[PDB]
């Protein structure tokens, strides 16, 4: 396997840091002027993580159309993802407005509400069937329908109601609950099992709007999820699966959102996930 001998060549040489900095050096730089307007300061979790103007998701309202979210459009793979930050106390209603407007079927959450003793995102979904949430600023109602709690992830069925039209939709919440507070998982087996559960749901498929993916900033763990998916899809589709270059896929994705893959360890974990997942592209 091409990728695995590169991995072994990089691992034996211990050059992960050097490969990673080469990506950072060649990555696209595009303007983010809307994200930096003074009226949007409380709509951004981190001062150094902004959506590019060319690829940002626009909210369908005349007041202020801004959300910290980007459309990643992978032309050859025929997949689209929205990557966004963990919602803030004043952006929970914007978040559900985006899910409604973009016709998403799935939300993928790769972080816990509290990590390292600090809050990484708002409690943006209801925890009990009989205690629904109402977002008065965007005129939406959200109800917990069911909850399936497993060892590495939880799947929730949610009902989102547009209170303006009384239309309802079923949204699936895929919550990966065991990514460690520091570093990356030791094995990618549970991450790959999670990705195939999202795929089987239909959430990644062209008959729906793009899946919404988030962690705290929406670039690290979120980056890893969409890079592994797109690389495995390209191996399925091409005559020479051995032509799939993970560094080139990552630079293509970084034309649409800055900073995807935050550390040299997340880059190595991404290689490991694609290598292991590839076994199934190898008819097993
Ligand atoms: O690198 C390779 O040799 C190779 C061959 C077949 C494959 N199918 C999916 C990945 C892959 C790599």
Three-state SS for the chain is CHHHHHHHHHHHHCCHHHHHHHHHHHCCCCCCCCCCCHHHHHHCCCCCCCCCCCCEEECCCCCCCEEEEEEEEECCCCEEEEEECCCCCCCHHHHHHHHHHCCCCEEEECCCCEECCEECCCCCCCCCCCCCEEECCCCEEEEEEEEEECCCEEEEEEEEEECCCCEEEEEEEEEECCCCCCCCCCCCHHHHHHHHHHHHHCCCCCCCCCEEEECCCCCCHHHHHHHHHHHHHHHHHCCCHHHCCHHHHHHHHCCCCCCCCCCHHHHHHHHHHHHHHHHHHCCC
The ligand 1 site (C-beta within 6 Å) comprises 1-2, 235, 241-242, 278, 281-282
**Does the annotation list 221 as a binding residue?**
yes
**Does the annotation list 217 as a binding residue?**
yes
Residue 272: in which H helix or E strand, if any?
helix 264-281
To test the pocket of ligand 1, the residue of 275, 282, 283, 284 to mutate (highest count of ligand atoms within 8 Å of its CB) is: 282
* Overall resolution, Å: 1.9
To test the pocket of ligand 1, the residue of 281, 283, 284 to mutate (highest count of ligand atoms within 8 Å of its CB) is: 281
Experimental method: X-ray
The residues carrying an active-site annotation are: 215
Contact 76, 244 (CB under 8 A): no
Residue of the CA atom closest to atom 12 of ligand 1: 242
How far, rounded to the nearest angstrom, does the alpha carbon of residue 51 sit from its chain's CA centroid? 14
**Residue 21, CB half-sphere, CA atoms under 13 Å: how many?**
4
Contact 140, 161 (CB under 8 A): yes
Q: Which residues contact 137 (CB under 8 A, 6 or more apart)?
A: 93, 94
Q: What are phi and psi of 212, to 5 degrees?
A: -95, 120
């Amino acid at each position: 396997m091409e990728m695995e001998k590169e991995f072994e060549q990089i691992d034996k040489s211990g050059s992960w840091a050097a490969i990673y900095q080469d990506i950072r050096h060649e990555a696209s730089d595009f303007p983010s002027r809307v994200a930096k307007l003074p009226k949007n300061k409380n709509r951004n979790r981190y001062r150094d993580v902004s959506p590019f103007d060319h690829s940002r998701i626009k909210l369908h309202q005349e007041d202020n159309d801004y959300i910290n979210a980007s459309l990643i459009k992978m032309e050859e793979a025929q997949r689209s993802y929205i990557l966004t930050q963990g919602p803030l106390p004043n952006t929970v209603g914007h978040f559900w407005e985006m899910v409604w407007e973009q016709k998403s079927r799935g939300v993928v959450m790769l972080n816990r509400v509290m990590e390292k003793g600090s809050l990484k995102c708002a409690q943006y979904w209801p925890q009990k069937e009989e205690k629904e949430m109402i977002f008065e600023d965007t005129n939406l109602k959200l109800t917990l329908i069911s909850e399936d709690i497993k060892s590495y992830y939880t799947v929730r069925q949610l009902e989102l109601e547009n209170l303006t039209t009384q239309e309802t939709r079923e949204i699936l919440h895929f919550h990966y609950t065991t990514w460690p507070d520091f570093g990356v998982p030791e094995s990618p087996a549970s991450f790959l099992n999670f990705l195939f559960k999202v795929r089987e749901s239909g959430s990644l498929s062209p008959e729906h709007g793009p899946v919404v993916v988030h962690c705290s900033a929406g670039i690290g763990r979120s980056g890893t999820f969409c890079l592994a998916d797109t690389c495995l899809l390209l191996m399925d589709k091409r005559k020479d699966p051995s032509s799939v270059d993970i560094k080139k896929v990552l630079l293509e994705m970084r034309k649409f959102r800055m900073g995807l893959i935050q550390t040299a360890d997340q880059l190595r974990f991404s290689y490991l996930a694609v290598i292991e997942g590839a076994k199934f592209i190898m008819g097993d």
